Write a protein that binds this ligand. Structure first.
Ligand SMILES: Nc1ncnc2c1ncn2[C@H]1C[C@H](O)[C@@H](COP(=O)(O)O)O1
Ligand SMILES: Nc1ncnc2c1ncn2[C@H]1C[C@H](O)[C@@H](COP(=O)(O)O)O1
Lengths: 113, 113
């Protein structure tokens, strides 16, 4: 293969508990949760990182946030949540396939790392 | 007025150092920076928080991330960065006008708050 972990999730080579799926994206629970609710929203299109996303990806990127919103509501995050994108080394990025974290179910602190 | 701080920035009632502006959004440095580079990207359209954004706002929300990318590059964040959206009480949201943080210039830690 040679793709990323999230490429493998998309092709059902690596398992994941999927909580939302449409023709453009998937959402699934994070394997190493940092809050009582912690899930990821990823595009099915491969983009390695936000710093190489293109202008015409705007609708797709916003779609990740809207899906994040919908999933947060489904999971009962009525007191709020935090969305995060990690870019590159200083962002702590591990998986080079663009994705959004959504964390909630506890008070989130500041700074955000 | 009765609007938010960022509503006031948009109408030039509260000052800000603006680093990007187009017909849809503004970006400016955060007044309480948590990293050597810390700026915000906001839509000119008022949306109180991400949890009430609508499907047809997807392009606008993605535009904030693309502008964040462009500004990060302008500011020399070649080692990476983190993007953050704070929603509601648990997200620590202070200003009820949708916006994206971009932080870089240091190693960002985990969890992200
Ligand atoms: N197999 C699997 N299932 C679910 N979640 C996973 C898996 N592998 C890694 N992860 C999560 C762990 C991190 O929160 C994120 C990668 O770091 P980042 O900094 O976001 O690139 O993705
Ligand atoms: N006047 C002004 N200029 C620039 N930045 C400002 C100003 N007032 C507040 N802020 C920043 C401070 C926080 O990082 C964010 C609000 O918290 P949040 O959790 O993001 O809603 O907005």
């Amino acid at each position: 293969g040679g793709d990323t972990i999230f490429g493998k999730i998309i092709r059902k080579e690596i398992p994941a508990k999927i909580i939302f799926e449409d023709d453009r994206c998937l959402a699934f629970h994070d394997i190493s949760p940092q809050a009582p609710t912690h899930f990821l929203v990823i595009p099915k299109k491969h983009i390695s990182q936000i710093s190489v996303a293109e202008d015409d990806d705007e609708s797709l990127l916003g779609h990740l946030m809207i899906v994040g919103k919908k999933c947060a509501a489904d999971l009962g995050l009525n007191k709020g949540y935090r969305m995060v994108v990690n870019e590159g080394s200083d962002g702590g990025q591990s998986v080079y396939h663009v994705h959004l974290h959504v964390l909630g179910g506890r008070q989130m602190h500041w700074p955000p790392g």
